[PDB]
Protein backbone atom coordinates (compact mmCIF):
# COMPACT_ATOMS: atom_id res chain seq x y z
CA UNK A 274 0.00 0.00 0.00
CA UNK A 275 1.25 3.47 -0.93
CA UNK A 276 2.60 5.15 2.21
CA UNK A 277 1.25 8.62 2.93
CA UNK A 278 3.90 11.28 3.54
CA UNK A 279 6.38 10.36 0.79
CA UNK A 280 6.72 10.19 -3.00
CA UNK A 281 7.77 7.08 -4.94
CA UNK A 282 8.52 7.51 -8.67
CA UNK A 283 8.82 4.98 -11.51
CA UNK A 284 10.75 5.83 -14.67
CA UNK A 285 12.29 3.65 -17.36
CA UNK A 286 15.91 2.54 -17.11
CA UNK A 287 17.01 4.43 -20.23
CA UNK A 288 16.12 7.79 -18.64
CA UNK A 289 18.12 10.03 -16.34
CA UNK A 290 16.80 8.50 -13.14
CA UNK A 291 19.88 9.52 -11.15
CA UNK A 292 19.41 13.06 -12.44
CA UNK A 293 15.74 12.98 -11.48
CA UNK A 294 16.73 11.70 -8.03
CA UNK A 295 18.89 14.81 -7.68
CA UNK A 296 15.84 16.96 -8.44
CA UNK A 297 14.14 14.98 -5.68
CA UNK A 298 16.79 15.16 -2.97
CA UNK A 299 16.26 18.91 -3.29
CA UNK A 300 12.52 18.40 -2.73
CA UNK A 301 13.10 16.61 0.58
CA UNK A 302 15.40 19.46 1.62
CA UNK A 303 12.65 22.06 1.14
CA UNK A 304 10.07 19.72 2.71
CA UNK A 305 10.30 16.70 4.96
CA UNK A 306 9.15 14.51 2.11
CA UNK A 307 11.62 11.82 1.11
CA UNK A 308 11.58 10.88 -2.56
CA UNK A 309 12.82 7.66 -4.15
CA UNK A 310 13.24 7.12 -7.88
CA UNK A 311 13.04 3.50 -9.04
CA UNK A 312 13.41 2.03 -12.53
CA UNK A 313 11.71 -1.37 -12.27
CA UNK A 314 11.76 -3.85 -15.11
CA UNK A 315 8.53 -3.84 -17.15
CA UNK A 316 7.17 -0.98 -15.05
CA UNK A 317 4.48 -0.20 -17.63
CA UNK A 318 3.04 -3.70 -17.17
CA UNK A 319 3.40 -3.77 -13.39
CA UNK A 320 1.77 -0.36 -12.89
CA UNK A 321 -1.86 -1.25 -13.76
CA UNK A 322 -1.62 -4.39 -11.63
CA UNK A 323 -0.10 -2.66 -8.58
CA UNK A 324 -2.30 0.45 -8.84
CA UNK A 325 -5.48 -1.66 -8.94
CA UNK A 326 -5.05 -2.57 -5.25
CA UNK A 327 -3.72 0.80 -4.10
CA UNK A 328 -0.02 -0.10 -4.40
CA UNK A 329 2.73 1.12 -6.69
CA UNK A 330 4.39 4.50 -7.21
CA UNK A 331 2.96 7.96 -6.66
CA UNK A 332 4.26 9.08 -10.09
CA UNK A 333 4.91 7.10 -13.26
CA UNK A 334 6.87 8.32 -16.28
CA UNK A 335 5.97 6.68 -19.59
CA UNK A 336 4.98 7.50 -23.15
CA UNK A 337 1.53 9.07 -23.35
CA UNK A 338 0.09 6.35 -25.59
CA UNK A 339 0.01 3.95 -22.65
CA UNK A 340 -1.71 6.48 -20.38
CA UNK A 341 -4.97 6.26 -22.32
CA UNK A 342 -5.33 2.69 -21.11
CA UNK A 343 -4.45 3.59 -17.52
CA UNK A 344 -6.93 6.48 -17.65
CA UNK A 345 -9.68 4.26 -19.08
CA UNK A 346 -9.12 2.00 -16.07
CA UNK A 347 -9.32 4.98 -13.70
CA UNK A 348 -5.72 4.44 -12.57
CA UNK A 349 -4.50 8.02 -13.15
CA UNK A 350 -5.62 11.10 -11.24
CA UNK A 351 -6.96 14.08 -13.15
CA UNK A 352 -4.54 16.98 -12.82
CA UNK A 353 -5.76 20.59 -12.70
CA UNK A 354 -2.77 22.82 -13.48
CA UNK A 355 -3.37 26.55 -13.40
CA UNK A 356 -3.28 28.51 -16.65
CA UNK A 357 0.05 30.04 -15.59
CA UNK A 358 1.62 26.58 -15.58
CA UNK A 359 -0.14 25.34 -18.73
CA UNK A 360 1.16 28.35 -20.68
CA UNK A 361 4.71 27.17 -19.83
CA UNK A 362 4.35 24.08 -22.05
CA UNK A 363 3.75 23.86 -25.80
CA UNK A 364 -0.03 23.56 -26.40
CA UNK A 365 0.17 20.39 -28.51
CA UNK A 366 1.89 18.50 -25.68
CA UNK A 367 -1.16 18.99 -23.44
CA UNK A 368 -3.24 17.32 -26.18
CA UNK A 369 -1.20 14.13 -25.69
CA UNK A 370 -2.23 13.84 -22.02
CA UNK A 371 -5.96 14.48 -22.51
CA UNK A 372 -8.40 11.62 -21.98
CA UNK A 373 -12.13 12.32 -22.34
CA UNK A 374 -11.43 16.05 -22.10
CA UNK A 375 -9.56 15.63 -18.79
CA UNK A 376 -5.87 16.25 -18.23
CA UNK A 377 -4.28 12.95 -17.18
CA UNK A 378 -0.52 13.59 -16.88
CA UNK A 379 2.22 16.23 -17.21
CA UNK A 380 4.10 16.36 -20.54
CA UNK A 381 7.89 16.14 -20.16
CA UNK A 382 9.65 15.25 -23.43
CA UNK A 383 8.74 15.17 -27.13
CA UNK A 384 10.01 12.66 -29.68
CA UNK A 385 9.39 12.19 -33.39
CA UNK A 386 11.19 10.89 -36.44
CA UNK A 387 13.58 13.13 -38.35
CA UNK A 388 15.64 12.87 -41.53
CA UNK A 389 19.19 11.81 -40.57
CA UNK A 390 21.83 12.35 -43.26
CA UNK A 391 25.56 11.87 -43.81
CA UNK A 392 27.03 15.34 -44.31
CA UNK A 393 30.06 13.92 -46.15
CA UNK A 394 27.91 12.00 -48.66
CA UNK A 395 25.05 14.50 -48.90
CA UNK A 396 25.71 18.08 -47.79
CA UNK A 397 22.46 19.23 -49.48
CA UNK A 398 19.82 16.76 -48.26
CA UNK A 399 16.55 16.89 -50.18
CA UNK A 400 13.61 18.98 -49.08
CA UNK A 401 11.11 16.87 -51.07
CA UNK A 402 10.37 13.18 -51.39
CA UNK A 403 9.91 13.73 -55.13
CA UNK A 404 13.61 14.37 -55.74
CA UNK A 405 14.78 11.21 -53.94
CA UNK A 406 14.63 8.94 -57.06
CA UNK A 407 17.00 11.18 -59.05
CA UNK A 408 19.31 11.67 -56.07
CA UNK A 409 19.39 7.91 -55.51
CA UNK A 410 20.55 7.37 -59.09
CA UNK A 411 23.28 9.99 -58.67
CA UNK A 412 24.52 8.69 -55.32
CA UNK A 413 24.65 5.14 -56.66
CA UNK A 414 26.88 6.42 -59.46
CA UNK A 415 29.11 7.61 -56.59
CA UNK A 416 29.04 4.30 -54.69
CA UNK A 417 26.25 4.95 -52.16
CA UNK A 418 22.48 4.66 -51.86
CA UNK A 419 20.19 7.57 -51.04
CA UNK A 420 17.94 6.28 -48.29
CA UNK A 421 17.50 3.22 -46.08
CA UNK A 422 15.00 3.06 -43.22
CA UNK A 423 12.79 0.48 -41.55
CA UNK A 424 10.02 -0.57 -43.96
CA UNK A 425 8.70 -3.38 -41.72
CA UNK A 426 7.09 -1.06 -39.14
CA UNK A 427 4.52 1.45 -40.51
CA UNK A 428 5.54 3.87 -37.74
CA UNK A 429 8.55 4.73 -39.92
CA UNK A 430 6.74 5.18 -43.25
CA UNK A 431 3.79 7.00 -41.65
CA UNK A 432 5.32 10.52 -42.05
CA UNK A 433 5.11 10.09 -45.83
CA UNK A 434 1.76 8.28 -45.85
CA UNK A 435 0.12 11.01 -43.76
CA UNK A 436 1.72 13.94 -45.62
CA UNK A 437 -0.87 14.54 -48.36
CA UNK A 438 -4.08 15.98 -46.98
CA UNK A 439 -5.91 14.82 -50.09
CA UNK A 440 -7.78 18.13 -50.37
CA UNK A 441 -6.82 18.31 -54.06
CA UNK A 442 -8.46 14.95 -54.82
CA UNK A 443 -11.78 16.46 -53.71
CA UNK A 444 -11.51 19.05 -56.48
CA UNK A 445 -10.49 16.37 -59.00
CA UNK A 446 -13.59 14.33 -58.07
CA UNK A 447 -9.99 13.39 -45.28
CA UNK A 448 -10.89 9.92 -46.51
CA UNK A 449 -7.94 7.80 -47.75
CA UNK A 450 -6.89 9.68 -50.91
CA UNK A 451 -3.85 11.30 -49.31
CA UNK A 452 -2.73 8.02 -47.79
CA UNK A 453 -3.15 6.34 -51.19
CA UNK A 454 -0.89 8.97 -52.75
CA UNK A 455 1.80 8.51 -50.10
CA UNK A 456 1.61 4.71 -50.20
CA UNK A 457 1.73 4.72 -54.00
CA UNK A 458 4.88 6.85 -53.92
CA UNK A 459 6.43 4.53 -51.32
CA UNK A 460 5.52 1.49 -53.43
CA UNK A 461 7.02 3.16 -56.51
CA UNK A 462 10.31 3.83 -54.71
CA UNK A 463 10.52 0.10 -53.97
CA UNK A 464 9.53 -1.11 -57.44
CA UNK A 465 12.03 1.31 -59.01
CA UNK A 466 14.66 -0.17 -56.66
CA UNK A 467 15.42 2.98 -54.69
CA UNK A 468 14.54 1.01 -51.54
CA UNK A 469 14.21 -2.68 -50.71
CA UNK A 470 10.98 -4.02 -49.24
CA UNK A 471 12.95 -6.25 -46.82
CA UNK A 472 14.92 -3.40 -45.22
CA UNK A 473 14.32 -3.49 -41.47
CA UNK A 474 15.58 -1.49 -38.50
CA UNK A 475 18.83 -3.44 -38.09
CA UNK A 476 19.70 -3.37 -41.81
CA UNK A 477 19.07 0.38 -42.13
CA UNK A 478 20.94 1.31 -38.94
CA UNK A 479 23.96 -0.79 -39.94
CA UNK A 480 23.97 0.70 -43.45
CA UNK A 481 23.83 4.32 -42.29
CA UNK A 482 26.32 3.89 -39.45
CA UNK A 483 28.76 2.09 -41.78
CA UNK A 484 28.51 5.01 -44.22
CA UNK A 485 26.84 2.94 -46.96
CA UNK A 486 23.71 5.11 -47.40
CA UNK A 487 23.35 8.87 -47.41
CA UNK A 488 20.11 9.04 -45.38
CA UNK A 489 18.03 7.20 -42.81
CA UNK A 490 14.86 7.99 -40.87
CA UNK A 491 14.99 7.48 -37.12
CA UNK A 492 14.39 9.12 -33.77
CA UNK A 493 16.56 10.53 -30.99
CA UNK A 494 17.03 7.08 -29.41
CA UNK A 495 19.29 6.19 -32.36
CA UNK A 496 21.70 9.14 -32.14
CA UNK A 497 24.24 7.71 -29.69
CA UNK A 498 24.90 4.73 -31.98
CA UNK A 499 25.68 7.11 -34.85
CA UNK A 500 27.86 9.13 -32.46
CA UNK A 501 29.96 6.02 -31.81
CA UNK A 502 30.23 5.45 -35.56
CA UNK A 503 32.56 7.43 -37.82
CA UNK A 504 29.66 9.19 -39.57
CA UNK A 505 29.58 12.99 -39.80
CA UNK A 506 25.79 13.15 -39.62
CA UNK A 507 23.10 15.80 -39.46
CA UNK A 508 19.44 15.74 -38.42
CA UNK A 509 16.86 17.82 -40.26
CA UNK A 510 13.22 18.35 -41.17
CA UNK A 511 11.62 15.45 -43.01
CA UNK A 512 11.09 16.06 -46.75
CA UNK A 513 7.75 17.34 -48.03
CA UNK A 514 5.36 15.34 -50.22
CA UNK A 515 3.18 17.05 -52.82
CA UNK A 516 4.30 20.33 -51.26
CA UNK A 517 3.08 19.32 -47.80
CA UNK A 518 5.08 18.43 -44.66
CA UNK A 519 5.69 14.88 -43.56
CA UNK A 520 3.52 14.16 -40.50
CA UNK A 521 5.32 11.79 -38.10
CA UNK A 522 3.71 10.32 -35.02
CA UNK A 523 4.60 12.20 -31.83
CA UNK A 524 5.45 10.43 -28.57
CA UNK A 525 5.21 12.47 -25.38
CA UNK A 526 7.03 11.15 -22.31
CA UNK A 527 4.63 12.08 -19.53
CA UNK A 528 4.39 11.98 -15.73
CA UNK A 529 1.08 10.71 -14.41
CA UNK A 530 -0.07 10.63 -10.79
CA UNK A 531 -1.37 7.32 -9.42
CA UNK A 532 -5.08 7.64 -8.69
CA UNK A 533 -4.72 5.38 -5.64
CA UNK A 534 -1.90 7.57 -4.30
CA UNK A 535 -2.62 9.51 -1.08
CA UNK A 536 0.06 12.13 -1.91
CA UNK A 537 -1.57 13.73 -4.96
CA UNK A 538 -0.99 17.23 -3.59
CA UNK A 539 2.65 16.34 -2.89
CA UNK A 540 3.31 14.95 -6.37
CA UNK A 541 1.67 17.98 -7.99
CA UNK A 542 4.12 20.27 -6.18
CA UNK A 543 7.20 18.25 -7.15
CA UNK A 544 6.32 17.96 -10.83
CA UNK A 545 5.13 21.52 -11.44
CA UNK A 546 7.52 23.70 -9.45
CA UNK A 547 10.65 21.49 -9.21
CA UNK A 548 10.96 19.02 -12.11
CA UNK A 549 9.31 21.07 -14.85
CA UNK A 550 11.74 23.96 -14.43
CA UNK A 551 14.84 24.91 -16.39
CA UNK A 552 16.83 23.63 -13.41
CA UNK A 553 14.88 20.42 -12.85
CA UNK A 554 14.88 19.40 -16.51
CA UNK A 555 18.61 20.13 -16.80
CA UNK A 556 19.43 17.86 -13.85
CA UNK A 557 17.71 15.04 -15.76
CA UNK A 558 19.08 16.11 -19.15
CA UNK A 559 22.63 16.18 -17.78
CA UNK A 560 22.27 12.54 -16.67
CA UNK A 561 20.67 11.33 -19.90
CA UNK A 562 19.35 13.60 -22.67
CA UNK A 563 15.59 13.93 -23.02
CA UNK A 564 15.75 15.11 -26.62
CA UNK A 565 13.16 17.83 -27.17
CA UNK A 566 11.16 18.92 -24.14
CA UNK A 567 7.65 20.31 -23.66
CA UNK A 568 8.90 23.16 -21.45
CA UNK A 569 9.12 26.22 -23.68
CA UNK A 570 11.95 27.90 -21.77
CA UNK A 571 14.26 24.88 -21.75
CA UNK A 572 13.42 23.72 -25.28
CA UNK A 573 14.56 27.13 -26.51
CA UNK A 574 17.97 26.46 -24.95
CA UNK A 575 18.13 23.00 -26.54
CA UNK A 576 17.11 24.15 -30.04
CA UNK A 577 20.69 25.41 -30.44
CA UNK A 578 21.43 21.73 -31.09
CA UNK A 579 20.16 21.32 -34.67
CA UNK A 580 19.22 17.70 -33.94
CA UNK A 581 16.88 18.74 -31.12
CA UNK A 582 15.49 21.66 -33.15
CA UNK A 583 14.70 19.32 -36.05
CA UNK A 584 13.00 16.86 -33.68
CA UNK A 585 10.64 19.54 -32.35
CA UNK A 586 9.98 20.90 -35.85
CA UNK A 587 8.99 17.47 -37.16
CA UNK A 588 6.90 16.89 -34.02
CA UNK A 589 5.02 20.16 -34.48
CA UNK A 590 4.19 19.16 -38.07
CA UNK A 591 3.11 15.63 -37.08
CA UNK A 592 0.26 14.09 -35.10
CA UNK A 593 0.11 12.83 -31.53
CA UNK A 594 0.30 9.04 -31.26
CA UNK A 595 -3.18 7.56 -30.74
CA UNK A 596 -4.01 6.74 -27.12
CA UNK A 597 -7.70 5.72 -27.22
CA UNK A 598 -8.00 1.97 -26.49
CA UNK A 599 -11.36 1.88 -28.29
CA UNK A 600 -9.45 2.82 -31.47
CA UNK A 601 -6.70 0.20 -31.11
CA UNK A 602 -8.31 -2.28 -33.50
CA UNK A 603 -8.74 0.46 -36.10
CA UNK A 604 -5.05 1.39 -35.90
CA UNK A 605 -4.02 -2.28 -36.01
CA UNK A 606 -5.93 -2.57 -39.30
CA UNK A 607 -4.21 0.60 -40.56
CA UNK A 608 -0.84 -0.93 -39.69
CA UNK A 609 -1.80 -4.16 -41.47
CA UNK A 610 -2.82 -2.31 -44.64
CA UNK A 611 0.45 -0.35 -44.74
CA UNK A 612 2.58 -3.50 -44.42
CA UNK A 613 0.57 -5.35 -47.06
CA UNK A 614 1.03 -2.47 -49.51
CA UNK A 615 4.71 -1.79 -48.77
CA UNK A 616 5.60 -5.49 -48.88
CA UNK A 617 3.85 -5.90 -52.23
CA UNK A 618 1.47 -8.47 -50.75
CA UNK A 619 -1.45 -6.34 -51.97
CA UNK A 620 -2.10 -3.42 -54.27
CA UNK A 621 -2.46 -0.06 -52.55
CA UNK A 622 -6.20 -0.12 -53.31
CA UNK A 623 -6.80 -3.69 -52.13
CA UNK A 624 -4.65 -3.23 -49.02
CA UNK A 625 -6.67 -0.26 -47.78
CA UNK A 626 -9.82 -2.40 -48.10
CA UNK A 627 -8.77 -5.92 -46.98
CA UNK A 628 -3.91 -10.78 -39.61
CA UNK A 629 -6.61 -10.47 -36.98
CA UNK A 630 -6.27 -8.01 -34.13
CA UNK A 631 -7.76 -10.78 -31.97
CA UNK A 632 -4.74 -12.99 -32.74
CA UNK A 633 -2.35 -10.32 -31.48
CA UNK A 634 -4.39 -9.81 -28.30
CA UNK A 635 -4.92 -13.53 -27.65
CA UNK A 636 -1.24 -14.38 -28.16
CA UNK A 637 -0.25 -11.47 -25.91
CA UNK A 638 -2.69 -12.51 -23.17
CA UNK A 639 -1.64 -16.17 -23.35
CA UNK A 640 2.04 -15.16 -23.17
CA UNK A 641 1.22 -12.86 -20.24
CA UNK A 642 -0.56 -15.67 -18.36
CA UNK A 643 2.38 -18.00 -19.03
CA UNK A 644 4.81 -15.44 -17.59
CA UNK A 645 2.59 -14.44 -14.66
CA UNK A 646 2.07 -18.06 -13.60
CA UNK A 647 5.68 -18.96 -14.42
CA UNK A 648 6.99 -16.20 -12.16
CA UNK A 649 5.66 -18.23 -9.20
CA UNK A 650 7.90 -21.23 -9.96
CA UNK A 651 10.92 -19.83 -8.10
CA UNK A 652 8.67 -19.07 -5.09
CA UNK A 653 7.38 -22.65 -5.09
CA UNK A 654 10.92 -24.02 -5.39
CA UNK A 655 11.82 -22.03 -2.27
CA UNK A 656 8.86 -23.54 -0.41
CA UNK A 657 9.34 -27.14 -1.54
CA UNK A 658 13.10 -27.20 -0.97
CA UNK A 659 12.47 -25.79 2.52
CA UNK A 660 9.93 -28.50 3.32
CA UNK A 661 6.74 -26.44 3.00
CA UNK A 662 3.89 -28.21 1.19
CA UNK A 663 0.72 -26.35 2.21
CA UNK A 664 -0.27 -23.13 0.45
CA UNK A 665 -1.39 -20.41 2.81
CA UNK A 666 -0.65 -17.29 4.80
CA UNK A 667 0.15 -18.92 8.15
CA UNK A 668 3.67 -19.65 9.35
CA UNK A 669 5.08 -22.88 7.96
CA UNK A 670 2.84 -22.62 4.91
CA UNK A 671 3.91 -21.49 1.44
CA UNK A 672 2.96 -17.83 0.92
CA UNK A 673 2.58 -17.31 -2.82
CA UNK A 674 2.68 -13.52 -2.91
CA UNK A 675 0.83 -13.52 -6.24
CA UNK A 676 -0.30 -10.30 -7.94
CA UNK A 677 -3.86 -10.05 -9.23
CA UNK A 678 -4.25 -10.06 -13.01
CA UNK A 679 -7.32 -8.81 -14.84
CA UNK A 680 -7.24 -11.61 -17.43
CA UNK A 681 -7.39 -14.35 -14.78
CA UNK A 682 -10.06 -15.81 -12.51
CA UNK A 683 -8.83 -17.20 -9.20
CA UNK A 684 -9.08 -16.14 -5.57
CA UNK A 685 -5.96 -15.42 -3.53
CA UNK A 686 -4.57 -18.39 -1.60
CA UNK A 687 -2.05 -16.68 0.71
CA UNK A 688 -3.82 -13.60 2.03
CA UNK A 689 -3.10 -11.35 -0.95
CA UNK A 690 -5.61 -8.59 -1.64
CA UNK A 691 -7.15 -8.76 -5.12
CA UNK A 692 -9.18 -6.12 -6.89
CA UNK A 693 -12.52 -7.15 -8.34
CA UNK A 694 -12.23 -8.54 -11.84
CA UNK A 695 -8.72 -9.88 -11.16
CA UNK A 696 -7.44 -13.33 -10.22
CA UNK A 697 -4.19 -15.14 -9.50
CA UNK A 698 -2.82 -18.45 -10.76
CA UNK A 699 -3.88 -21.29 -8.45
CA UNK A 700 -1.09 -23.25 -6.75
CA UNK A 701 -1.34 -26.83 -5.49
CA UNK A 702 1.50 -28.61 -3.70
CA UNK A 703 2.03 -32.20 -2.66
CA UNK A 704 4.27 -33.78 -0.03
CA UNK A 705 5.94 -35.61 -2.94
CA UNK A 706 7.20 -32.32 -4.39
CA UNK A 707 4.81 -32.40 -7.33
CA UNK A 708 3.10 -29.06 -7.90
CA UNK A 709 0.81 -27.29 -10.33
CA UNK A 710 0.30 -23.61 -11.14
CA UNK A 711 -3.00 -23.17 -13.02
CA UNK A 712 -3.89 -19.82 -14.57
CA UNK A 713 -7.54 -19.79 -15.66
CA UNK A 714 -8.56 -17.14 -18.17
CA UNK A 715 -11.47 -15.01 -17.04
CA UNK A 716 -12.63 -11.51 -16.19
CA UNK A 717 -11.14 -9.17 -18.82
CA UNK A 718 -9.45 -11.88 -20.89
CA UNK A 719 -10.43 -11.93 -24.55
CA UNK A 720 -13.51 -13.89 -25.60
CA UNK A 721 -10.99 -15.87 -27.66
CA UNK A 722 -9.75 -17.18 -24.29
CA UNK A 723 -13.04 -17.29 -22.33
CA UNK A 724 -15.43 -18.86 -24.87
CA UNK A 725 -14.42 -22.32 -23.55
CA UNK A 726 -12.67 -23.20 -20.26
CA UNK A 727 -9.05 -22.37 -21.01
CA UNK A 728 -5.95 -22.68 -18.83
CA UNK A 729 -2.20 -22.31 -18.78
CA UNK A 730 -0.68 -24.84 -16.37
CA UNK A 731 2.86 -25.20 -15.06
CA UNK A 732 3.40 -28.73 -13.72
CA UNK A 733 6.31 -29.61 -11.44
CA UNK A 734 7.48 -33.21 -11.50
CA UNK A 735 9.01 -34.76 -8.39
CA UNK A 736 12.54 -34.26 -9.78
CA UNK A 737 12.04 -30.49 -9.82
CA UNK A 738 11.57 -30.05 -13.58
CA UNK A 739 8.76 -27.80 -14.82
CA UNK A 740 6.74 -27.93 -18.05
CA UNK A 741 3.91 -25.71 -19.29
CA UNK A 742 0.70 -26.74 -21.06
CA UNK A 743 -2.00 -24.54 -22.57
CA UNK A 744 -5.57 -25.43 -23.48
CA UNK A 745 -5.78 -22.32 -25.65
CA UNK A 746 -5.76 -22.82 -29.40
CA UNK A 747 -2.30 -23.52 -30.81
CA UNK A 748 -2.86 -20.43 -32.97
CA UNK A 749 -2.52 -18.40 -29.75
CA UNK A 750 0.25 -20.43 -28.09
CA UNK A 751 4.03 -20.20 -28.07
CA UNK A 752 6.77 -22.80 -27.80
CA UNK A 753 7.07 -21.93 -24.09
CA UNK A 754 3.65 -23.50 -23.33
CA UNK A 755 2.26 -25.65 -26.14
CA UNK A 756 -1.05 -27.44 -26.26
CA UNK A 757 -1.12 -31.15 -25.47
Ligand SMILES: N[C@@H](CCC(=O)O)C(=O)O
Pocket residue numbers: 605608633
Ligand atom coordinates in the same frame (compact mmCIF):
# COMPACT_ATOMS: atom_id res chain seq x y z
N1 LIG B 1 4.75 -4.25 -30.92
C1 LIG B 1 3.49 -4.86 -31.33
C2 LIG B 1 2.64 -3.85 -32.11
C3 LIG B 1 1.26 -4.37 -32.52
C4 LIG B 1 0.24 -3.26 -32.70
O1 LIG B 1 0.51 -2.32 -33.48
O2 LIG B 1 -0.83 -3.34 -32.06
C5 LIG B 1 3.76 -6.11 -32.18
O3 LIG B 1 4.19 -7.14 -31.64
O4 LIG B 1 3.58 -6.11 -33.39
Ligand SMILES: N[C@@H](CCCC[NH3+])C(=O)O
Pocket residue numbers: 662663664665700701702703704
Ligand atom coordinates in the same frame (compact mmCIF):
# COMPACT_ATOMS: atom_id res chain seq x y z
N1 LIG C 1 -1.36 -27.49 -2.06
C1 LIG C 1 -2.65 -27.77 -1.48
C2 LIG C 1 -2.62 -29.14 -0.78
C3 LIG C 1 -1.78 -29.19 0.48
C4 LIG C 1 -1.18 -30.58 0.73
C5 LIG C 1 -2.17 -31.70 0.44
N2 LIG C 1 -1.67 -33.02 0.91
C6 LIG C 1 -3.01 -26.65 -0.52
O1 LIG C 1 -2.17 -26.15 0.22
O2 LIG C 1 -4.16 -26.20 -0.50
Ligand code: NA
Pocket residue numbers: 412413416417418
Ligand atom coordinates in the same frame (compact mmCIF):
# COMPACT_ATOMS: atom_id res chain seq x y z
NA1 NA D 1 25.16 2.06 -53.47
